[PDB]
Amino acid sequence: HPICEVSKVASHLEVNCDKRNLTALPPDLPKDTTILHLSENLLYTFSLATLMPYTRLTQLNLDRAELTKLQVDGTLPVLGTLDLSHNQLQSLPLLGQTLPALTVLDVSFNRLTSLPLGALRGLGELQELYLKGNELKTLPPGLLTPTPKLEKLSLANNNLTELPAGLLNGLENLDTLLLQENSLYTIPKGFFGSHLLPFAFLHGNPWLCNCEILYFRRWLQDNAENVYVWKQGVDVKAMTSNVASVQCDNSDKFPVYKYPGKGCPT
Ligand SMILES: *[C@@H]1O[C@H](CO)[C@@H](O[C@@H]2O[C@H](CO)[C@@H](O[C@@H]3O[C@H](CO)[C@@H](O)[C@H](O[C@H]4O[C@H](CO)[C@@H](O)[C@H](O)[C@@H]4O)[C@@H]3O)[C@H](O)[C@H]2NC(C)=O)[C@H](O)[C@H]1NC(C)=O
Ligand SMILES: [Pt+2]
Ligand SMILES: [Pt+2]
């Protein structure tokens, strides 16, 4: 109670242990704790197990903590949100066997260059995945199979050149897809499926406007009302689209939805 700043507000309390040169979990944290901020600390190494005691813990922040190795010992059946952004994890952690109730996981701006074959197994309650800012160049086959309830996915600002044709297969709740600032050249036929994607960010990519981009073109047209441009400091980006932001080779004067496709089949 008297080490970090403990908030209160109706039952579920919030403990802030940020910017406090901590190298590990502080000993006198209230037991019936629910949210823990531990950002801007020196957690070069951290063991999810040391939280076994806080049976009411639902949100944990370990962002901007020079984190390099996350240990996944036992279980925290009630943890739903986990923030790992702005650390140095060279490999993505396997949380399935520990955070069965995790609905949000952010592992942005870390040092990821790929993702394992079972990466998200067990994470069936996931509703949000943030992996923006790494150096992913390719995604695994059924990555999102374990997460059929996914709503938001961020793979922005990586080095992706191609996306799996079925990456979205099954996700009928998906509403936000951020793939901006990558190295994508095309979208596999029927990639978006028939689902309705409200917020799709596809700008900043070197799209190759050849016949094999006519699928994406029609989609762009059908969903021009759903294509937006990212604004850092995000303003909920809830208003005014810009389908002309998706462009051939990133040339502003040659948006994809206006791509002619001269001499292409129907
Ligand atoms: C992922 O995509 C981003 C966005 O496109 C990309 O950023 C830019 O890439 C170029 C490289 O094509 C950057 O220039 C780099 O500068 C250093 C050179 O020392 C290196 O990062 C790159 O090449 C080096 O690679 C090794 C060192 O890492 C060595 O073999 C040797 O030093 C090579 O030169 C490249 O030259 C350019 O500055 C960035 N822009 C910025 C400021 O971000 C990023 O490079 C891509 N990363 C991957 C996964 O390749
Ligand atoms: Pt960030
Ligand atoms: Pt759908």
β-bridge partners, 153: 129, 177
Query: Would the CB of 113 count as within 6 Å of ligand 1?
Result: no
How far is CA 105 from each of CA 96, 150, 203, rounded to the nearest angstrom?
11, 11, 24
Whether 93 contacts 111, CB under 8 Å: no
Q: Give residue 157's identity as a one-letter amino acid code.
A: N
The pairing of beta strand 13-16 with beta strand 5-6: antiparallel
135 lines ligand 1 (CB under 6 A): yes
* CA distance from start to end of the chain: 67
Domain count along the chain = 1
Q: Which residues contact residue 169 at a Cβ distance below 8 angstroms, ignoring those fewer than 6 apart?
A: 144, 193
Sign of the Cα pseudo-torsion (144, 145, 148, 149, in order): negative
**Spacing, Cα 213 to ligand 2 middle (Å):** 31
The answer to whether 137 touches 114, Cβ cutoff 8 Å, is yes
**Surface-to-core class of residue 10, CB atoms within 10 Å of its CB (0-12 exposed, 13-18 middle, 19+ buried):** exposed
Domain of residue 21, residue span:
1-266
Q: Which of 246, 177, 248, 166 is nearest to 207 (CA)?
A: 248
Which ligand gives the minimal distance to the CA of 195? Answer: 3
String of DSSP letters for 185-208: ----TTSSTTS--SEEE--S----
The amino acid occupying position 27 is P
Q: Which residues lie below 8 Å from residue 19, measured CB to CB, with a gap of 6+?
A: 39, 40, 41
- Residue with the smallest CA separation from ligand 1 atom 8 is 159
User: What is the Å distance from ligand 3's center to 92 Cα?
Assistant: 28
Least Cα distance to 189 among 218, 161, 223, 148 occurs for 218
What residues contact 127, with CB distance under 8 A and at least 6 apart?
Answer: 103, 104, 149, 150, 151, 152, 173
CA dist., res. 122 & res. 100, Å (int)? 6
Nearest listed ligand to the Cα of residue 133: 2
| CA 78-79-85 angle, 5° bins | 175
> What CATH number should be reported for the domain holding residue 227?
3.80.10.10
Question: Which ligand has the minimum distance to the alpha carbon of residue 106?
Answer: 2
What letters, b where the CB count within 10 A reaches 16 and e where it falls short, cover 186-213?
A: bbeeebbeeeebebbbbbbbebebeeeb
- As beta bridge partners, residue 82 has 60, 105
Answer yes or no: is the C-beta of 222 below 6 A from any ligand 1 atom. Answer: no
Closest CA to 258 of 266, 249, 246, 250: 246
Q: How many whole angstroms from 71 Cα to the centroid of ligand 2?
A: 23
